[PDB]
Amino acid sequence: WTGQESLSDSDPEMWELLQREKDRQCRGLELIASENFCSRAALEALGSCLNNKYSEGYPGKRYYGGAEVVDEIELLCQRRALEAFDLDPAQWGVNVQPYSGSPANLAVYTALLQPHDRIMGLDLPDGGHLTHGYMSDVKRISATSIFFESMPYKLNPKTGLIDYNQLALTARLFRPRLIIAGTSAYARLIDYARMREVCDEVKAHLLADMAHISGLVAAKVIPSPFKHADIVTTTTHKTLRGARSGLIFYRKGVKAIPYTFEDRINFAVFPSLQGGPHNHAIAAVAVALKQACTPMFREYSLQVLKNARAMADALLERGYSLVSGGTDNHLVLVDLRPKGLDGARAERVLELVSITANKNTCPGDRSAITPGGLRLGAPALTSRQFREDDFRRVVDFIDEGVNIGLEVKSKTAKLQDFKSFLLKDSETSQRLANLRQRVEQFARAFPMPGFDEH
Amino acid sequence: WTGQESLSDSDPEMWELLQREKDRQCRGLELIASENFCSRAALEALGSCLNNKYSEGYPGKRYYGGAEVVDEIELLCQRRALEAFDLDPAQWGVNVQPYSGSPANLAVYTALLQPHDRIMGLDLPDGGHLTHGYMSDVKRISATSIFFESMPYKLNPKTGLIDYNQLALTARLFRPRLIIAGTSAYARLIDYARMREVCDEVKAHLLADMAHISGLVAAKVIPSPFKHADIVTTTTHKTLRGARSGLIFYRKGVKAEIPYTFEDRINFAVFPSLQGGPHNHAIAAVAVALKQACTPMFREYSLQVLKNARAMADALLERGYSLVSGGTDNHLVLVDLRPKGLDGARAERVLELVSITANKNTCPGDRSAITPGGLRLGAPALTSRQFREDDFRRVVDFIDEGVNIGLEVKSKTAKLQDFKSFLLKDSETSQRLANLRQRVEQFARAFPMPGFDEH
Amino acid sequence: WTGQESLSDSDPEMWELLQREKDRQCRGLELIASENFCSRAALEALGSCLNNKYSEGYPGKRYYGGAEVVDEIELLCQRRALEAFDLDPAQWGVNVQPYSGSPANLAVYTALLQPHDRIMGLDLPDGGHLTHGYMSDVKRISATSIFFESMPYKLNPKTGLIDYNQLALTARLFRPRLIIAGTSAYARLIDYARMREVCDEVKAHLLADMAHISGLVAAKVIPSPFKHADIVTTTTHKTLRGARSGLIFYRKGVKAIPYTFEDRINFAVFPSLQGGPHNHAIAAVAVALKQACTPMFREYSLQVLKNARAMADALLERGYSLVSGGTDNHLVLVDLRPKGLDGARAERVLELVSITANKNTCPGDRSAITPGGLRLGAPALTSRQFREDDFRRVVDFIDEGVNIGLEVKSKTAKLQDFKSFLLKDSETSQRLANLRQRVEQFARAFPMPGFDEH
Amino acid sequence: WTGQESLSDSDPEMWELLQREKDRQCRGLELIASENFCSRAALEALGSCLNNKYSEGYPGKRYYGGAEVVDEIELLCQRRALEAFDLDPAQWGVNVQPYSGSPANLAVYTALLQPHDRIMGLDLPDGGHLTHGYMSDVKRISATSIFFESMPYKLNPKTGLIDYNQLALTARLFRPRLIIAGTSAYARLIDYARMREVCDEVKAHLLADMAHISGLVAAKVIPSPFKHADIVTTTTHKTLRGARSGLIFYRKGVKAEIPYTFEDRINFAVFPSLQGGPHNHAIAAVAVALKQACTPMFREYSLQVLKNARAMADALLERGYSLVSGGTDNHLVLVDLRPKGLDGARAERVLELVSITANKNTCPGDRSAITPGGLRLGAPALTSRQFREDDFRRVVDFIDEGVNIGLEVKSKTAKLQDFKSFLLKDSETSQRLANLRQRVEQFARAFPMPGFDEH
Ligand SMILES: [Cl-]
Ligand SMILES: [Cl-]
Ligand SMILES: [Cl-]
Ligand SMILES: [Cl-]
C-alpha cells in the first residue's frame, strides 16, 4: 500500500457510484435553482494535497508553522474575492474560511450579537432560508432561532413581493439588531435601499445573503447589495459555479468613528465556531473567483437572465401563472393552482422523466403537504450552453409532464394514490418512459463541465 | 469555455501554488500530531461531480429529488462507518454529514442540551480542544462557552494524568449535563470506565471525542470508547487518514422499556438546525477512507504508529529529554523542554526553519502561553510515508541538533523577538540552519508520499 | 427598655414626621389615580404582632411550626378574596403572599415562562405599567424585559384606544406566550373578549392586571376580567383601599385536560422568588377584602364612577380635551395641548396649591420632558365622601392653577424658568398662596379614614 | 362608614385571630433563630398613613409630587442606617426600599450581573439561604438559580466549618462573578478576609448577606463584614428587631482614579427594574428600629444574646448533647440529635406540642431531608423578653424532657407518621405532653413582651 492507487482500482464499488451520479447529471434536465456544474479546474484544486494541511488561524497569525504556501493561497482567495465584486480593499474585507453558507451566517450572528438578540428575516414559506431565523408555531427549527430571537417579515400576498411597509412597521416594535436581506425562492430584486432605511431607523445592521444571486452580482447584471449592506454572506456554489464553501464580506474603515466588523467576524469563524480551515475548498473557490472576473462569466450570467426570461415567457404563453407575474433573476416561480395541479404532484412526475425541480410554497397555500408551486432554475443548464430556444424546448417537456399529472390526478384521490399510479398503471408508465427517453436523448447532446467520467 | 480545461492550463498561478505545497509536504518532516497524508483514492472522490448535488435531508427523506445515487453513497458511508469500528447497527447509528470535527461537537450540544446547559471538558492548556468549552479569565473564546456553560477539569501536575478524583469532586458540585472524554495533546489512554462512573452518578451524558485516536480505535490497537460512551464524535482526517469531515456515533435501542432518544435529536440538530446541504463529495471521500480502515493494511499501519511513537519517546529519553507523563501510549509524544534550558516557542521556530514542523505545547504547571515550555510531536504523518523505528530515531537526531542550535542562540539573545531575528540575521547561524535543512530535506524526499504526484 | 413605649415618647423626630404627612394628606386634594386612604381597621392589623411570625410555605405545608393561627389568617384571606370577586372555589384559587403588585406580576412570569420567553403588554407611554415589559431604544429598563423578551402593543393615536387590530397582526408574527391586559393610565374599558380571541389564536395565556380597577370589579360596577382571563393579578391598595400588598388569581379545575396553574404559581412565589410572608400585610388585606363585600363598598365604587364622570364633564364644559373623549372608570386623562400648556408645567403649579396630580404622556407627544397630559383620579377624594358637586369645585381650583400657569408660561422660556418664576416672582407667589389657602381650607373640612394623628 | 372604626368593632373575626396569635407568642418559648419581637414604637409607624403615599423614585427624584415629608423619612432612614453600622457616608451608601431580604439579594444580582452570570453561595443543607442559588439534582428551586448560574460551596464535615480551601479550589475553575458570604444556619464567624482573598484572585464581587447577624454587627459585638465586603444586604427583622423589610449597603468613592460604580446600578435595579412603589410605612418602622440599634440598650441586648446562646450551648453539652462545630460564636446553636437516638423531625414535632418552637436542621454528612438529624435553636427572641442565662438553662431542661418523651415514643412506633399520630392518640403520652406544656406556658407567660398588649 502506497496511497497512490487510483479510486477505480482500489474501490470499484465507490467508483461505480461516482459514474452513476455523473451519468445521472448528464442525462437529466437539472432545473433546481441552487445547483450548478463546477469546472474541472476547481475540482482539481478541491481534490488536492491541500487537504493535508492544518492551518488554524489567519495568514501571518497561525497556530502552527509551515503555512507559507497556505498563507499565499488564502490571501490570493481574499484578493480574487474582492476583485470579483469590484470592492475597494480599503472599504471591504473578506473571510474565506466558512465551510458552507449556513456556517457563514451563523458566524455573522455570533460575531455581532449576544445570545437571544433579535433578528428579522424573510419567512421560510415566503422565500427565505432556514438560517434566517425560522421557527414554527410548535418548535424552534433553525439554530438561528434557538440561540437568537427571530421574527419574520412576510410577502404581500396580492403582489407576491416583500411587504416593505409591514416590515418597517414591525421593525419599530420588535427592535431587531440585525435584518437579513436575502432569499432562496424569490424571482424579483430586493430593494436594498429601502432595507437600509428600515435598518437606519431601528439602528440595526443590514446583512445581505446573496447566495442565490452572487454570480449575477459579480457579472454586474443586477444591482449590487454592497452599496447598502453592512455585511454580505454568500455560498461559492450556486450561481458562482464553484466548490461548496462560504464567504463573509464585511465593511472596514471609517463609518462616520471606524467600523468594528473585522476583528469580530474573524474571531467568530475561528476560534469560536470552526476548527482547521479546508484549504482544498479555499483554493477551489479561488479558482472559481478568477473565472468570475472574465468576460466569459459576464456572458454566462447574461445568458442565465435571458434563459430564465425565456422559460418564463414560454410558460406564460402556454397559460401558466408565475408568482410576482414574472422574473428578474435566475429562477421562476410557477403557480400550478390555476392549472389544477400542485407542486408535490408535478415534482414527482417530472422526476420520473429525468427533470429535477422542487415544489415551492405559493402565496395562499394553507397545506404544506401539497404546495401549489414549483421552483425552476436556469444556471445549471446554462452552464451546459443552453440557449433561449433550448429552454423553450424544456418548457415543452415540462408541459407534457404536467398534462400527464392532470390525467393521473383525475384517476386518483390522495397524494399516495397519485405516486403509486405512476408506477403501477402500465399505460402511464409507457407514457412516462417515452417522455423520459426524449428528455434524456435531448439532454445528453449538450456538453458538461468537469471531468469526463466522475 | 467548456469547464473541462485543466487547472494547469486555466489557472497557472494556482497550479504553481499547489505544486509548491506538494513539494513542501514531500521535503519536510511533518511531526504535527493532527496531520496525515490522504490517499489518492479518497482525493479523487473529494474532487468529483458530487460537489454539484444538493441533497438536503437524509436517505429516503430528501427535500429535492434525483438523489437515488447520493442516497446510496451516504448509506454506504454509514455502513462502512459501523464496520470500521465493529459496531452493531441495532445498538449504534452514525451521522456522516458534519462538515468537520468542530461542527460535529456543536451539533451534539444543540441536540442534547438547552442553551446555557452545563458541560465539562478537559481544559485547553491541559490538553483539551477548543470545542470542549474553553474560556479565559477575560473572554469567552469557544462558541461552546457562549451558548453553553462550561467548567474545565484539569491534569494532576504531579503525574501529568487526568485527575479523575478532582473531576468527580467538581462534577458533583457543578452538575454537568454532558461530560467530554477526549483530548488533543495527551499521550496516555483515557479511563473511560471511570468517566462512565462519574457520569452515572451525576446523570450526565458521556461524549467521547476520539478525533486524535480514531484510527487506532478502528484498528483495535487501543481500548475502544464505544464500550462506555453515549455519543462518539470524530474527525475523518487525523489518524483515520481521510478527507476533512466529521462523524457522530450515537447509541440506539434500549437504555434500561427505557429507549435511547439520541437518533432523532442528533439528526435534527445537524439538519435543518445547523447545517445546509451536505458535502456529498466529502462523504464519498470519507467512505473510501473508511473502507481502507477495515483492511489488514490499516492494522499494520496503526501498530506501526504506536511503535514509531514509542521509538521516538525512547530516543528522546536516551538524550536526556523529559516527557510529560513519562512516555506515551498512543500516537504522540509530549516533550518538556524546560529542564533542557529552552522553551516551546523558541524550539518551534528553529525546527520550522529546517523543515521540521511541530507545535509548542503548554506543560503541566506553567501559565505563560506566549512561551510554553513543551513541544508536541506526532507519528501518524511520517508513518504513512513508511517510516519505521530507525527512521524516527533519525528524526530525533535532527531535532536534537535543532534544540542545540536554539540553545546557542538563546545565550546570545534576550527576548523572543531578538531570538527569531537572530536566526535570520546571523550569518553563522543561518549557515548551520541551511546545512541542517539540506540534510533533513534530503532524508525526507527519499520516502514515498500518498496522493497525486504533483498536487 | 420593654419595647412597649409609644412612638411619640421614644422617637419624637419620627412621630413629628408622621404627623406632618398626616396633615399633608388632610389639607390637600389628592388626585393621583393610584392613591387611596386606608381604613383604621386595616392599619391596626398592619401594625400588629403578626410581623413577628416566620411562616415560610403555605397553610398545612409550613417549614416551621407554631403556624396554627397564621394558617387560619391566610386561609381566611384566601376565602375573602374569592368572595370579594364572586369566584367559585372549584374554578379559582388565589395566592395572597406577593409583597406588592410588581412582585405579583414577576411571580406569574417566573411560574409560566422560561427565561427569554415572549410577552406582550401595552407600551408604557400608551398607558401600560413598567412590569408589562418596558424597554427603551437604548436600555432594558424593567426586569420583565431583561429576563424575558417583550414587545409592546400600542394605542390607535386617532381614537386614543387600544389598537386591537394591530395587536392581533403583530401577535401572529411575534408569537408571545403570555399577553397582559391591564393599564395604569387608560380611561376606557378593556375588550377582554377580544384579548381572549388573540390569545386563543396564538395559543398564549391571558393575564389581567386589574390593579387600578380591582375595587370597581369587586363592586360589579364594571365588567369583570375573570370571565376571560387565565391569570389575574392586582394590588390590594389603589381602588381596593387596603394595605400595600399583591394578589394572584389563577384558574383551577378542568380546562378542556386540567389546568396546571396552581402548583406553578405557588412555587414561584415561594420558594423561588420570596422569603417569609408578611402576615401583618396579609391580615390587613383580609380586613380590606371583607369591607369590599359590603353594600357600602358598592356605593363607594358607584360614587367613584360618578365623581370621575363629573370631573370629566366639568372639564369639558370649560373647554378641556380628554384623551379618548371621556372616561368609563375612576380616572380622566386631560390633554392640555389644545389649551396651550403641558403636564410638566401644570403638575408643578397644582402641587404648589396643595393639589397632587401627575403628568401623563398623550397620544402625539414626542418629548418626554414636557408631556402634554395630566392624569386625575377620583378614588382618593371619594373616600373622604366627596360628591359630584365637590369634584366640580375641584375642577374650579384646577382651572385657576392652569390659568396661572398659562400666564407664567408667556413670561418664561423653558421649564426651568417656569419653575423658578413660581417661587421668585412675588406677584405670582401671592396669587399661588391665596389659591392654596382656599384649597386647603376646602379640603380640611372633609373627613379622613384611618387614625386621627398619624 | 368613615374608615375610622376600630378593628375589634368592624372585623371581630380578624380581631379574635390577632389576639390568639398574641397569646401564642406570649405563652410559648420561641427558639426559631429567625424571629424576634418588634417594639411597639416600630409597629405604630408600620400601621400609619404612610401606607397611603405613592413615592416611586428616590428623594429629590420622584415621579409624583407631594413627597416632601416622605423624602425626609427615607433620607432619615438612610442616615440612621449608616449611623447604626458606623459607616462613612463618603464610602458607603444605602438603599432602604427592598420589600424584604429576598428582594434585596435579587436586586443586587440584577444590578451587577447579566442573566446566566455565575454566583457561588453556601449550599442550603450546609447552612446557606435559598436566595444564594439553591438547586436540586432534579429542579432549579430558587429564582437565583433560574436567572443566574449558581454553584455551591460546602462545609468541611470533619469540623463543621466552611471549607475555605475547597472554596478557593472550585472558585478558580467555576470563575464566579459574585461570591456570597452569609448564612442562615451557622454557629461560627465567617472569615471575611479569606473570602476577600478568593474574590480578589478570581475578580469577583463579595456580597455579605448578614441578615441573621446584623443586630450583633450594629452593636459591635462581632467583627463587621463591612471591612471586606463590596455589597452588604440584610433583613431589618431577625436580630435588628425591626419591621420586615430589607437593606442594601454598597461602597462608593474610589476603588483603586478607579471609582465604584455600584450606586447607580443598585438604585436602578430596585426601581424601576424590580419593585414598584416603596412601602413608606415599612421604611419608617425600619428607621425607628435603626434608632434603637444605636442606643446603649441595644448593645447590652446583643451582648446578652451571645451570653444566652453560650449558656444554652453549655447546658446542652452538660446533658450529653453534641453541637455542630462544637459550640457557637453568635446567636444560634446547632444540635446534632443523631448520637442521642432521635432526629430533627421527631424532636421538632414533640417540642411544638409543648409550646417550644424550633426547626429541624440538616447535619454535616447526612442527606435525608425528610428526617434531618439536627435542630436549630435561637436566642434573640427570648432575650428580647429579658431572658437571662439561668432562664435559658431552664429552657434546656424543658427541651431535655421533650427529647426523652420523643425517645420513648420512637421505641413504640416505626414510621414518622406513626410517631406523629402516637403523640395525639396515646392517652399516657398526651398527658405527659399536657403537663410539660402547662409548665412551659406558665414559665413563658411571666416574662414581658414587646409590642402592644393584646395584638
Ligand atoms: Cl436553496
Ligand atoms: Cl489538534
Ligand atoms: Cl400607577
Ligand atoms: Cl432563616
Residue numbers in the entry:
A (entry chain B), C (entry chain B): 43 to 298, 307 to 504
B (entry chain A), D (entry chain A): 43 to 298, 306 to 504
Provide text from the study.
Serine hydroxymethyltransferase (SHMT), a ubiquitous PLP-dependent enzyme in the aminotransferase superfamily, catalyzes the reversible conversion of L-serine (L-Ser) to glycine (Gly), transferring a one-carbon unit to tetrahydrofolate (THF) to yield 5,10-methylenetetrahydrofolate (5,10-MTHF). As an enzyme in one-carbon metabolism, SHMT is essential to the synthesis of thymine nucleotides, purines, methionine, and other essential biomolecules. SHMT is found as a homodimer in prokaryotes, such as Thermus thermophilus (Tth), and a homotetramer in eukaryotes, such as humans. Like many metabolic enzymes, SHMT is evolutionarily highly conserved, especially in the active site, enabling us to utilize SHMT from Thermus thermophilus (TthSHMT) as a model of the mitochondrial human enzyme.
For direct comparison with the joint XN structure, we also determined a 2.5 Å room-temperature X-ray structure of hSHMT2 in the internal aldimine state. PLP-bound hSHMT2 forms hexagonal, rod-shaped crystals, space group P6522, with long cell edges (>150 Å) that diffract X-rays to resolutions of 2.3–2.5 Å using synchrotron radiation at cryogenic temperatures. We were unable to obtain neutron diffraction data from the P6522 crystals of hSHMT2 because they diffracted X-rays at a synchrotron only to 2.5 Å. In our room-temperature structure of hSHMT2, the substrate binding pocket is occupied by a chloride anion, Cl−. The affinity of this pocket for anionic ligands is probably dictated by the nearby positively charged arginine residue, Arg358 in TthSHMT or Arg425 in hSHMT2. In hSHMT2, the Schiff base rotates to a much greater extent, with the corresponding dihedral angles in protomers A and B of 67° and 73°. The Schiff base out-of-plane rotation appears to be the attribute of the NSB neutrality as was also observed in the joint XN structure of AAT44. Therefore, the above considerations point to the high probability of NSB atom not being protonated in hSHMT2 either. Protonated N1 was also observed in the joint XN structure of aspartate aminotransferase (AAT), another fold type I PLP-dependent enzyme, where it is similarly H-bonded to a conserved aspartate residue. Because the active sites of TthSHMT and hSHMT2 are conserved we propose that N1 is also protonated in hSHMT2, participating in an H-bond with Asp251 having the N···O distance of 2.9 Å. The H-bond network connecting PLP O3′ to the main chain NH of His380 is identical in hSHMT2, suggesting the same protonation states of O3′, His254, and His380 in the human enzyme as observed in TthSHMT. We believe Glu98 in hSHMT2 is also deprotonated because the electrostatic environment is the same in the substrate binding pocket of the human enzyme.
